[PDB]
């Protein structure tokens, strides 16, 4: 009874969002409440089964996300796995995050929205999510419910126990997956510790742990990733959060892979986007898509 009409409302909300039109404050409130109710049961490592389509940073670009859905298929037909950065310097961040959260609520067994570094109250205020939210709503309400919904988003994901999908990188204090399980993710990201490094880290070329160029988190070399993979018994560490020119990149001798799925990032780097598709044969098929179809004053 109630479930049927609620699912109809969710489907209508997704259909309206697909037309670039935002939702109402009450609708965002109900969506955030339902999404938190759903996500509170998801562990710090969300075990997700193949087949899956691992996507990376979207960063508010909504037409670019629609292009993504046009390359790999639509939900619930295609099983997706997003890892962070749906907001913050996208010109349509609210629509992107609302669509992803609605897809997670309506198709809880088909989507898996992870948590990124640009998903926290600190980051969302300076880099154009609070400002965009005020421009599109006039109050800090729906921004507030989006940011405290961001708390319950899972930190990691394990695809068939062999692909380790996280938004950032490995932690100096974390050696096994059980350490990530022991973490308490029902809070904003800290400025230090395991939880911050799981979303702020970066793979580098030099071996061993290193200082991050972003000042937050650490960097891990090839041997760190090799040790982590041989200790956890898994074949690949998928990640995002780093801009890659070709859309996807392989690091540490094909041990980790960066999947950045926001094309034309910064509008002047010209980078492509990539998504990573997995089947039960575990074949990594990387798709790419760059497009999404003087200034006026000087015209």
């Amino acid at each position: 009874m109630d479930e049927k009409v609620f699912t109809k409302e969710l489907d209508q909300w997704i259909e309206q969002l697909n037309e670039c039109k935002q939702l109402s404050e009450s609708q965002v409130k109900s969506l955030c409440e339902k999404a938190k109710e759903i996500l509170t049961k998801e562990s710090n490592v969300q075990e997700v089964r193949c087949p899956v389509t691992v996507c990376g940073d979207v960063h508010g670009q909504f037409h670019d996300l629609m292009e993504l859905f046009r390359i790999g298929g639509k939900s619930p037909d295609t099983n997706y796995l997003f890892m962070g950065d749906y907001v913050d310097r996208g010109y349509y961040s609210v629509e992107t995050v609302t669509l992803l959260v609605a897809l997670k609520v309506r198709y809880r067994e088909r989507i898996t929205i992870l948590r990124g570094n640009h998903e926290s109250r600190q980051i969302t205020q300076v880099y154009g999510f609070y400002d965009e939210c005020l421009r599109k709503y006039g109050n800090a309400n729906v921004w507030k419910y989006f940011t405290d919904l961001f708390d319950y988003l899972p930190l990691t994901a394990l695809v068939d126990g062999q692909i380790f999908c996280l938004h950032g990188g490995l932690s100096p204090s974390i050696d096994t997956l059980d350490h990530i399980r022991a973490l308490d993710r029902l809070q904003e990201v800290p400025h230090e510790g395991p939880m911050c490094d799981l979303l702020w880290s970066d793979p580098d070329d030099r071996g061993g742990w290193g200082i991050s160029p972003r000042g937050a988190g650490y960097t891990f070399g090839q041997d760190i990733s090799e040790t982590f993979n041989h200790a956890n018994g898994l074949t690949l560490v998928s990640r995002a959060h780093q801009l890659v020119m070709e859309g996807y990149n392989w690091c540490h001798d094909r041990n980790v892979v960066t999947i950045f799925s926001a094309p034309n990032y910064c509008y002047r780097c010209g980078n492509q986007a990539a998504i990573m598709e997995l089947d039960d044969t575990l074949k990594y098929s990387f798709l790419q898509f760059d497009p999404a179809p003087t200034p006026d004053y000087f015209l």
Partner: protein
């Protein structure tokens, strides 16, 4: 009563959103207050109220335009003038534009006596103010009061406009150049020639190139008012100086408005002066000017003089097009490609085959995706004029080679063009060459391409019949059901869905139904609930016996699966089919 008082208090509030909501509901406040009270104590509160932000002032300016009935009709509308005069002076250009628009809207309710006594003095006050925002707002209030005042007031308004065009702040001149075409439409022709032409010539040679690029629109709007004989002596020299302008923005504006210029000046002046101007614009050293000029190529060549249309095209425009095809700029090629195909019917079949066809081939094999995309988008124009017996020898290899190119938008364009193309080639020849192409599209690594090829398969089936599908197309579709990549199994399901309604009842029952039923045991829940969706979609065409005998047990078995999605999509499949 109480909510209206809440609104009245809410005009003076610390919350921007609440104040904006109160101002947006000013009509109810005025209705409750009454015409006399609004004229006496509500409106004067709205004249000094300029302390707000952009949205609040913009909403107030919009509301004041529709206030003339709430203050007491068209007789007391002059009391609406102080708030709008105050709003036309603000710094925000959107608020200024809306205040000007509302002043113009309520200027049609002024009686001519009230006009010359209250609104014309307002225009003089705005155009003689010390703030250049007031004069910028006054530039747009001369075309609404001119045709309804006396001769003396007309002369004063013309003098004030002439002073506006000769101002010292670039913004006022730039705003007067925009409204010069509008002001010239309400003038007298003798007055036009005597006054606007010096004004237009002075604005067209302004020290600021941002005021020069509005003289192009002024020229377009002026050439439509003068006789064809007076254009050469009054307007044409300035247009020639504007096409050959030193600033690339003025040349870009001329290229952008070239079609309107050709329409306005009359075909003889086009053939005489504008054709060299068009050639010089298409050979411009500026990439954006070249792109703007190439955007108008087909329209300009179509609107040329019919006496020597194709002759002048081939003699003058064609070499410059052959040069633009080989250009070093992506936008110029992408803009010429989207418009070049329309030139084919004008030249005819023989001229097309001789000259345009090498250009079409060079643009189809261009390294830029946009050029190829536009050429394929407009291929129908030449396909209609050169027929099908001549198209294939020169064009078909390009389509076949480009249906497998990198950019999937080009592949999608070819997919959309494929049904219309193959319709003219018949089943016998399409099967030999293009059927493999249409089948290989179904396996493409982009879901958009798979869906496009699915729709194209529907179109091909509806064009060629069901027997061809049953013999050569359907077995190939079911061949993908054993694909190790489950995306392609979903693609087979999608193809069966889009083929069920068009391929036929008995054929759906006997050939593709068993695969849809069998795929319900796929170890990927996505294929299971897509089988549920496919069965729901296909149900209406099946007969009762096959439905209730085979589909019902299989669809019901999907309602015991562990996945929630399969359960839901089978549950809202039994009920829609009335099988529950």
């Amino acid at each position: 009563l109480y909510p209206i008082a809440v609104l009245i208090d809410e005009l003076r509030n610390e919350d921007v959103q609440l104040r904006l909501n109160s101002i947006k509901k000013l009509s109810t406040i005025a209705l409750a207050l009454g015409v006399e009270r609004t004229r006496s104590e509500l409106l004067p509160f709205l004249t000094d109220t300029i302390y707000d932000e952009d949205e609040v002032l913009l909403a107030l300016a919009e509301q004041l335009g529709t206030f003339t009935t709430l203050v007491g009709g068209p007789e007391y509308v002059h009391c609406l003038l102080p708030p709008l005069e105050s709003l036309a002076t603000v710094e925000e250009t959107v608020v200024r534009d809306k205040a000007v628009e509302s002043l113009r809207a309520i200027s049609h309710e002024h009686s001519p006596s009230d006009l010359e006594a209250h609104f014309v003095p307002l225009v003089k006050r705005l155009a003689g103010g010390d703030w250049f925002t007031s004069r910028t707002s006054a530039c747009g209030l001369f075309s609404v009061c001119y045709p309804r005042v006396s001769s003396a007031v007309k002369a004063e308004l013309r003098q004030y406009f002439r002073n506006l065009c000769s101002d010292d702040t670039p913004m006022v001149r730039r705003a007067a150049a925009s409204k010069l075409g509008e002001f010239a439409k309400v003038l007298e022709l003798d007055n036009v020639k005597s006054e606007i032409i010096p004004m237009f010539s002075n604005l067209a040679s302004d020290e600021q190139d941002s005021v020069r690029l509005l003289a192009v629109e002024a020229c377009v709007n002026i050439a439509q008012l003068l006789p064809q004989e007076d254009l050469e002596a009054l307007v044409m020299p300035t247009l020639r100086q504007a096409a050959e302008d030193k600033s690339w923005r003025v040349r870009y504006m001329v290229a952008d408005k070239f079609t309107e210029l050709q329409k306005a000046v009359g075909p003889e002046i086009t053939k005489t002066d504008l054709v060299p101007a068009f050639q010089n614009l298409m050979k411009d050293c500026e990439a954006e000017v070249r792109a703007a000029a190439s955007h108008k190529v087909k329209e300009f060549c179509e609107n040329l003089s019919a006496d020597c249309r194709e002759n002048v095209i081939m003699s003058q425009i064609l070499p410059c097009i052959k040069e633009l095809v080989s250009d070093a700029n992506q936008h110029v090629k992408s803009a010429l490609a989207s418009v070049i195909m329309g030139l084919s019917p004008i030249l005819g079949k023989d001229n097309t085959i001789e000259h345009l066809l090498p250009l079409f081939l060079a643009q189809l094999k261009d390294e830029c995706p946009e050029v190829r995309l536009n050429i394929i988008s407009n291929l129908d124009c030449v396909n209609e004029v050169i027929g099908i017996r001549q198209l294939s020898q020169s064009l078909l290899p390009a389509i076949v080679e480009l249906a497998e190119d990198a950019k999937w938008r080009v592949r999608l364009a070819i997919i959309e063009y494929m049904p219309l193309l193959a319709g003219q080639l018949g089943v016998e020849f399409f099967d030999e060459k293009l059927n493999s192409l249409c089948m290989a599209w179904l396996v493409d690594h982009v879901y958009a391409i798979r869906e496009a090829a699915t729709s194209n398969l529907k179109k091909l089936v509806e064009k060629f019949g069901k027997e061809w599908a049953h013999a050569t197309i359907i077995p190939k579709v079911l061949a993908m059901s054993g694909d190790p990549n489950y995306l392609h199994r979903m693609t087979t399901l999608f193809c069966i869905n889009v083929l069920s309604e068009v391929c036929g009842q008995d054929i759906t029952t006997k050939h593709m139904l068993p695969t849809v039923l069998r795929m319900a045991g796929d170890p990927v829940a996505n294929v299971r609930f897509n089988v549920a969706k496919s069965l729901q979609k296909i149900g209406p065409i099946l007969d009762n016996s096959t439905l209730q005998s085979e589909v019902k047990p299989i669809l019901e078995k999907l309602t015991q699966d562990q996945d929630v999605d399969v359960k839901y999509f089978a549950q809202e499949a039994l009920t829609v089919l009335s099988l529950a």
